């Protein structure tokens, strides 16, 4: 699994591959690893599909009930709810989650929650087995306050490499763009990204 | 550890060694392996020192509560069964106990119950428990009679511990003697094995293998 | 299970003024069972003395081996082996079994016949040499002996004072060890006389 | 029972004549991966205490929140919360030590080694250690992990016993701490060049220094080293 | 094999050895003689792992019988015991050691003395007035320590041995089917056929 | 796997005089081959003229001392400020220890003070609460190095009167507080030479009818 | 064990502590951890004490024979190659961790060698359980172009760090200085900062304290004439 | 505990149970009665893990004695055996099961018939003419298969039982110190004091 | 360990970090992992120091004896001798070796020999624990027929990232340049490469 979230000028973009494996068999080649917990707070799932799905569902419930009472939650609040579940159930979970969201006040924000249940607010985050191969590339090529087109290219190029080298990653590159304008889904096929 | 208790005409004799070892090194030579449950009842310590000491002291509290409530001395059968039922609740948890609950009542006469941390409760006439038990049994079995005098019975128990103290590496230090009568137990002293061995060797002509 | 504490027993050696002393208990056991009260652990090849603790079959074997080797040494060299040379022989001999060692704690003691110098040495089971000025300890009560020796010992003791020190070091150490005791022997070694004394001690 | 995941390395500290110094690098390691490069592992509590934490970072963040909550709670119905009934270093430590030992006793430890550095009401220096086992000890110098093996020997050359504390100035103490941080950077494979340092002085109070770097590094001798034995 | 005892008296050595041969569930034999005559005045009893016991005992027997022919001379008990010890000491560091414990009871015709040697499978030799292997000593040694005298007659030794066997039959969990007793003295080796 | 136990080293020594008692212990605290502290007090005044040390795993040692001290406080509340006698303290500590029979305090505990007749008293406890009154007891790392020496020099074991040759034992004459302190110091000096976990400092707490006094001595720091 | 090597202008200095341990017990308070391979090639040894002695004497013996055969003074690189190939063959079962130093016709050299057979070159090295304490001191005070006096100081200070702070190390500091165009000087017990203080009491017993069963003269002499 | 046998004859049930109590190395007792009277015409012998055996037997005894008082009526052997089976069947899926095997010998006063029930620690019940637990059956069943007749007298049953005990004493490695034999018939329970 | 060999126009350059670790302790911070087997055939060592040193020494012996008999060996021949040792002793070795050499006929050549003992001729090769983090970067930035200065920059930048992320890597970046001109050693210190 290769996943990343990158903040830019207009907001944040989440990116992910679409491969689910059982050993060396690809059980699902069109998985959606980018999941909605609120209108403009999404997450990237790495680790156990069952665990990360179960967690995300509970978070979506918590933020729905939060919204009914207190209005729209912050991206920080969403990351805290994710953290609470991941930290308090660390012994029984295998979940690495990147939480990404767009406020109007705060703008684009990215929080990574690795295996332990710790929280790390970052300009961008990479995770999953395929992320190891692109630490060098991402660190050399990331800039703050990129445009939408630059950030799409940055994510597309990064995940292209992660996919190239990691057998656990593959299929399509899905992306979700979070800005004031709304929520845009993007997809990029092998014939496009492999030739980069 | 060598502990014995046997029944005879004049009551019960209880005799124990004094040694405690951690690995190969002798932690103590001055251990009290007779628990004085109350003035009429005695218990021997083998296996876990803490388990025997703690739970047989507790037993003395239960015996005291019994006689307050029933206005009558607790029977050795009843006292031993309080202990055996208690340890049986803990079975599996890892208590280590091998003990002789010893008493002399009118209804029963002199009585010994071997109680043990896997729940065993046995009435009997002669019991030996510990790493030096087999040595003590040898001397006991060949010299034991019901019609022993109190003086000879005391010596027999002393000598049987000496036999074990000599051969068994984990037994020694000193011998503690007790004589249990119907009117209560009587302490018959602490006997250093070192001094006792040479005394017995000379006076008895035994241990000719050993140079003295 | 641990070969160095099946049979039990101890050796201690000390230096004094123009003299050395070496001593050992007499116990041989099968773990908790006492088997023999006459198992001596000190041997000699001419004027060089060797104590050996540990696994009793190896104690016996190594004694037989060093008798063999010192006998041939004497035939070829036309003289008795010295403590310093013997120490190196013991070290060599043990190390040649590096990966299948004798489970022993040897202790060399003696006086060099030419220089008159008192000498003691200890070894681990694979032949590392500890050549102490003061004292060497070995066996199942080596901790106890270290404690006794470290407080009781003083340098340049006369033979008859050194006897009392080493005896009390051995005896009180052995009484705090389940696997040592059952009698004891002390060798007092001077340049051209050696006195051997059996000690009276508790037999439990 | 768990295993630590994201981890923080050495925390080092020492007493000097008027207070205490404590330091810790800004790295959150993920095994051999040097994952997070901006992690603050010194956490000040009030103006008189700094708690330095090594080991598991998620547990550190939990401890961080417990301390934040402790300050809130101390303020409740407390008119002297910023004066006589403010939190002392000794109160903060004893709390943490209780928590650490309680957690190990339930077989569910907070996977940390913690050093509480501060100055008490009466001007006394406070420096004490507690870890995942609830083990505690105090000493003129204290260090966790690699710091225990490499920093302590250096810091003990400055303050070898209690009587050396009044003779040690803040400049000497800070110099020793900064040199120790350099030694740890050379030799600890899970360390970073960037670190934070805190001084708690009875006169000048809490000085918290962020974004420090290991400097004056000797590498030049590396050019002359060729092969592993016989090569030229 | 189970119980093997030995007692050296004034003028002889007495070896008592159990008759039972048990293979797990059933007692296959109740009349097994766990001994070999090495030379006219030297007897060796043995106990340990199945197969190895007899194989070792007969191997030793053959070697002593070879020596006896070659030199036209009977080796002393001491010499035989040293030979046996070395074989076991050699054996313990082998690929597959002999798991055999032995008692060597002999009468030295030169010194006019009985001798009893106890040697375990490691090659641990001791000369004793009385000895045993395995658990046998645990029951019996307290009796032997008490009653034994170096000037005992053969008949007194046999009575002390009966007391030892009785204590074993009382307190041992295993039925060892009694013992065969043999006496080694100046006239050689003979079996006590009623015990 | 998580191991809840650890070894902080150290060595302690309790000796009961005729009308006094001493409880000594080194001040070194260690883990593995490292020194944590050269001065970490291990012997404590618990009130009511009782001194205590729980040597071994320091987290359990501190927990136990803390709980016992608390037991002294509540004894005063519950029983009209009655003085907790050393024998009563001992029995109480047994129950504290045995309370954790199946997850033990990993310590060897010694307490010292005076009995109800004013005589010196030492009590020694195993990790699970078995205990006995004793004259002499070393606990911890270098206990095997100290006890044989104390058998020889306090109780005069294996020492006979010159001329008699083993027939008359050396008589057990009473030692003064000054004489005991010499034997304590020499026990720890010797233990320091031959045991790597013993050193740095020696703190002795002396108990008499007048109260609790402290003495401190340097030990080798290597 | 705390062993170090330090390079200086005209040579190399080597140092070690003097404690040997069996678990937590000090078996020897004045252990010699410095070994002579040849007159001007010495090494410091950590790990299994029997192995460090055995491996240095074997290679030292073969070095001597090689020196005689070739009519040349031995080289450190020869000792180094012979040690590493031997230790590599035994796959780490020979527990010898050595700092090898010396002077030869090529110059002055300093190497470390691990039990598995890997070697390393350096200007300053340390090894053993006190290596981290020693290396801290070396990393704080080492510089290029040390004099002989500065190197002996730095080396012995690094050993002291180990003595005091590491429980595996103790007692005294041994040093050996190997300077170019000079005899190697072996400074045994260069520092002695751990002399035991006078005891409170004398434990010399009165004569006849010990009980004695038997006495006899041992015949150490050979079979006599006449 | 070791050997427990049972044989149902014409008009009675005979239970034979070993007297030895061994704790590892030593035989602590040679006169142990491994049985409890549950009611006047129902006897239960038992063997299994130390402590559990007696605890279980007395627990069953107490419950049957309670039933006897409450209803003023003796439960049939069948009823008692079913009660015991259920307790053991409940026990096997407990936290710590009773490791106890039992034989229940009873005389049904309603049907005028002896009945023998064999129940192992799992709660496996069978009614039999003769039964055993552990290894006891391996030695004895070939003899019982041959000689047994449903019309045997009590004396003939005791003779067949002696032959079973003799075969056990021959071929079993363990010394079980003989057996206590008890007879359950229309007149109740009685112990054969010479066997 | 972070090691690489890169072929360019004038020949080949070998690059390596200088860190040797025992657990988290840095046993040697100035290790030379670039080793000479012939005048213009060198190698990069990853895995066991003892194994790779022992192997390299044997190879140097084999190529010395080859040279005495048959003249200068090819880089392919050197890689074959490495392979033979690595493959035939695969059960007892932990050695990942990159063999790099300059012929006049063949020019710059790079052979990588991973754990199994297989041989792979490549335009460039990366290896050691730190190589994982720079697969993406190296693949995106490598070009054939670079100049000497470009290849030095490529290696320097790559190993800088490998060091940044891998705790097992660090210290100085050493390089060895192999061309017709001869053999040039280069070194780059932390203060230089960390700021890249
Ligand atoms: C029930 C479930 C845990 C199981 N597999 C996974 O989660 C697998 N993981 C992956 O496919 C990717 O690593 C994941 C990334 O991150 C991706 C699925 C989100 C694992 C190798 C077994 C399944 O659905 O078979
Ligand atoms: C005691 C402590 C020292 C413990 N040792 C024992 O219980 C040892 N037993 C004995 O010394 C005696 O056999 C015991 C008898 O019975 C005696 C201590 C009651 C055991 C073999 C290990 C321990 O090492 O924890
Ligand atoms: C494995 C080795 C390298 C090191 N061992 C030691 O330093 C141990 N020291 C010793 O064994 C002796 O002092 C030896 C030294 O070396 C000395 C006797 C040669 C320490 C107690 C732990 C280690 O484990 O790192
Ligand atoms: C004797 C030797 C095998 C041992 N260590 C290594 O080989 C260590 N490896 C490294 O330091 C680097 O990974 C290696 C790269 O590749 C570098 C040294 C070539 C390993 C973690 C144990 C040692 O010297 O301790
Ligand atoms: Mg004994
Ligand atoms: Mg003894
Ligand atoms: Mg020390
Ligand atoms: Mg790095």
GROMACS .gro file of C-alpha atoms in nm, chain A residues 47-191:
model
  145
   47UNK     CA    1  -0.222  -0.180   0.739
   48UNK     CA    2  -0.517  -0.411   0.805
   49UNK     CA    3  -0.818  -0.345   0.576
   50UNK     CA    4  -1.052  -0.485   0.840
   51UNK     CA    5  -0.899  -0.270   1.119
   52UNK     CA    6  -0.875   0.054   0.918
   53UNK     CA    7  -1.230   0.014   0.778
   54UNK     CA    8  -1.367  -0.055   1.127
   55UNK     CA    9  -1.179   0.247   1.270
   56UNK     CA   10  -1.288   0.482   0.987
   57UNK     CA   11  -1.652   0.377   1.031
   58UNK     CA   12  -1.638   0.459   1.406
   59UNK     CA   13  -1.468   0.794   1.333
   60UNK     CA   14  -1.738   0.881   1.075
   61UNK     CA   15  -2.000   0.801   1.340
   62UNK     CA   16  -1.821   1.019   1.602
   63UNK     CA   17  -1.787   1.318   1.366
   64UNK     CA   18  -2.150   1.280   1.249
   65UNK     CA   19  -2.265   1.297   1.613
   66UNK     CA   20  -2.018   1.580   1.681
   67UNK     CA   21  -2.164   1.776   1.387
   68UNK     CA   22  -2.525   1.735   1.508
   69UNK     CA   23  -2.428   1.887   1.844
   70UNK     CA   24  -2.134   2.126   1.791
   71UNK     CA   25  -2.122   2.197   1.414
   72UNK     CA   26  -1.836   2.113   1.174
   73UNK     CA   27  -1.530   1.954   1.344
   74UNK     CA   28  -1.172   2.063   1.283
   75UNK     CA   29  -0.923   1.837   1.105
   76UNK     CA   30  -0.731   1.829   1.436
   77UNK     CA   31  -1.046   1.699   1.612
   78UNK     CA   32  -1.081   1.420   1.352
   79UNK     CA   33  -0.714   1.321   1.394
   80UNK     CA   34  -0.767   1.314   1.773
   81UNK     CA   35  -1.063   1.073   1.740
   82UNK     CA   36  -0.854   0.850   1.508
   83UNK     CA   37  -0.566   0.870   1.757
   84UNK     CA   38  -0.784   0.782   2.056
   85UNK     CA   39  -0.900   0.459   1.888
   86UNK     CA   40  -0.555   0.369   1.751
   87UNK     CA   41  -0.367   0.446   2.075
   88UNK     CA   42  -0.612   0.288   2.321
   89UNK     CA   43  -0.642  -0.030   2.107
   90UNK     CA   44  -0.275  -0.047   1.991
   91UNK     CA   45  -0.238  -0.410   2.111
   92UNK     CA   46  -0.520  -0.533   1.880
   93UNK     CA   47  -0.479  -0.305   1.575
   94UNK     CA   48  -0.254  -0.282   1.271
   95UNK     CA   49  -0.345   0.059   1.134
   96UNK     CA   50  -0.134   0.338   0.986
   97UNK     CA   51  -0.365   0.627   0.899
   98UNK     CA   52  -0.302   0.965   0.734
   99UNK     CA   53  -0.582   1.212   0.819
  100UNK     CA   54  -0.626   1.501   0.574
  101UNK     CA   55  -0.879   1.785   0.587
  102UNK     CA   56  -0.975   2.134   0.470
  103UNK     CA   57  -1.105   2.405   0.706
  104UNK     CA   58  -1.157   2.764   0.589
  105UNK     CA   59  -0.983   2.900   0.903
  106UNK     CA   60  -0.691   2.650   0.910
  107UNK     CA   61  -0.685   2.557   0.534
  108UNK     CA   62  -0.517   2.226   0.427
  109UNK     CA   63  -0.384   2.011   0.714
  110UNK     CA   64  -0.223   1.665   0.725
  111UNK     CA   65  -0.188   1.440   1.031
  112UNK     CA   66  -0.013   1.103   1.023
  113UNK     CA   67  -0.093   0.832   1.277
  114UNK     CA   68   0.160   0.545   1.256
  115UNK     CA   69   0.132   0.201   1.424
  116UNK     CA   70   0.189   0.319   1.783
  117UNK     CA   71  -0.105   0.564   1.789
  118UNK     CA   72   0.113   0.880   1.799
  119UNK     CA   73   0.004   1.190   1.603
  120UNK     CA   74   0.233   1.395   1.382
  121UNK     CA   75   0.113   1.709   1.206
  122UNK     CA   76   0.312   1.752   0.883
  123UNK     CA   77   0.317   1.955   0.559
  124UNK     CA   78   0.293   1.619   0.380
  125UNK     CA   79   0.296   1.253   0.482
  126UNK     CA   80   0.375   0.921   0.314
  127UNK     CA   81   0.290   0.572   0.442
  128UNK     CA   82   0.239   0.204   0.357
  129UNK     CA   83   0.496  -0.052   0.238
  130UNK     CA   84   0.562   0.138  -0.088
  131UNK     CA   85   0.646   0.464   0.092
  132UNK     CA   86   0.997   0.336   0.185
  133UNK     CA   87   1.113   0.361  -0.178
  134UNK     CA   88   1.009   0.728  -0.216
  135UNK     CA   89   1.143   0.892   0.107
  136UNK     CA   90   1.440   1.021  -0.094
  137UNK     CA   91   1.231   1.139  -0.389
  138UNK     CA   92   0.953   1.306  -0.187
  139UNK     CA   93   1.202   1.487   0.040
  140UNK     CA   94   1.394   1.621  -0.260
  141UNK     CA   95   1.085   1.728  -0.460
  142UNK     CA   96   0.830   1.857  -0.203
  143UNK     CA   97   0.781   2.234  -0.176
  144UNK     CA   98   0.530   2.424   0.037
  145UNK     CA   99   0.252   2.627  -0.127
  146UNK     CA  100   0.254   2.436  -0.458
  147UNK     CA  101  -0.034   2.480  -0.703
  148UNK     CA  102  -0.302   2.216  -0.758
  149UNK     CA  103  -0.137   2.098  -1.082
  150UNK     CA  104   0.211   2.076  -0.924
  151UNK     CA  105   0.077   1.881  -0.624
  152UNK     CA  106  -0.112   1.639  -0.851
  153UNK     CA  107   0.213   1.587  -1.046
  154UNK     CA  108   0.416   1.545  -0.723
  155UNK     CA  109   0.174   1.280  -0.589
  156UNK     CA  110   0.143   1.110  -0.930
  157UNK     CA  111   0.523   1.088  -0.976
  158UNK     CA  112   0.585   0.976  -0.615
  159UNK     CA  113   0.323   0.698  -0.615
  160UNK     CA  114   0.437   0.594  -0.964
  161UNK     CA  115   0.779   0.514  -0.815
  162UNK     CA  116   0.632   0.354  -0.502
  163UNK     CA  117   0.422   0.129  -0.730
  164UNK     CA  118   0.719   0.054  -0.962
  165UNK     CA  119   0.929  -0.093  -0.681
  166UNK     CA  120   0.674  -0.224  -0.427
  167UNK     CA  121   0.497  -0.549  -0.518
  168UNK     CA  122   0.236  -0.477  -0.249
  169UNK     CA  123   0.132  -0.160  -0.441
  170UNK     CA  124  -0.026  -0.122  -0.785
  171UNK     CA  125  -0.333  -0.073  -1.001
  172UNK     CA  126  -0.471   0.280  -1.039
  173UNK     CA  127  -0.359   0.593  -0.856
  174UNK     CA  128  -0.665   0.746  -0.688
  175UNK     CA  129  -0.659   1.101  -0.556
  176UNK     CA  130  -0.900   1.322  -0.361
  177UNK     CA  131  -0.862   1.703  -0.373
  178UNK     CA  132  -0.987   1.905  -0.074
  179UNK     CA  133  -1.028   2.284  -0.124
  180UNK     CA  134  -1.280   2.564  -0.060
  181UNK     CA  135  -1.425   2.481  -0.405
  182UNK     CA  136  -1.534   2.135  -0.283
  183UNK     CA  137  -1.432   1.771  -0.323
  184UNK     CA  138  -1.280   1.644  -0.648
  185UNK     CA  139  -1.198   1.278  -0.719
  186UNK     CA  140  -0.914   1.195  -0.961
  187UNK     CA  141  -0.797   0.866  -1.110
  188UNK     CA  142  -0.480   0.786  -1.310
  189UNK     CA  143  -0.434   0.460  -1.500
  190UNK     CA  144  -0.115   0.248  -1.549
  191UNK     CA  145  -0.062   0.354  -1.913
   0.00000   0.00000   0.00000
